[PDB]
């Protein structure tokens, strides 16, 4: 499939334990994948002073559309000083390892795999 339904833990950002992906913009868009597919990704929601507390590069999970089943459409770029490898709408986070943190909430997304 093309497309993936997904319910993804929303952590608080003080909470997580694994603070990203990896060390380059291709292992952490890697990384996120694998995590997504395995169940083990959680979603962080940007606010002021989040990203700061979070290792780059960045996984962000972007709206690439305008909802099948509850499920917002979202794909993944990447950041890394300030460059950002990927075009996509607004941001609804960032991705980090889940290594069983207990989430806020779920976010229900539809991922472009």
């Known amino acids: 499939?093309?497309?993936?339904?997904?319910?993804?833990?929303?952590?608080?950002?003080?909470?997580?334990?694994?603070?990203?992906?990896?060390?380059?913009?291709?292992?952490?868009?890697?990384?996120?994948?694998?995590?997504?597919?395995?169940?083990?990704?959680?979603?962080?929601?940007?606010?002021?002073?989040?990203?700061?507390?979070?290792?780059?590069p960045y996984v962000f999970i972007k709206r690439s559309d305008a909802a099948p089943h509850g499920h917002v459409m979202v794909e993944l770029v990447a950041e890394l000083e300030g460059i950002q490898y990927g075009r996509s709408g607004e941001t609804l986070g960032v991705l980090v390892p889940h290594v069983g943190e207990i989430p806020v909430a779920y976010r229900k997304v539809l991922l472009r795999k």
């Open 1 to 56: 499939k093309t497309h993936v339904q997904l319910s993804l833990p929303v952590l608080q950002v003080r909470d997580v334990l694994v603070r990203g992906f990896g060390d380059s913009v291709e292992e952490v868009l890697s990384e996120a994948r694998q995590h997504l597919k395995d169940g083990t990704c959680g979603l962080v929601e940007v606010e002021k002073g989040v990203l700061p507390q979070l290792e780059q």
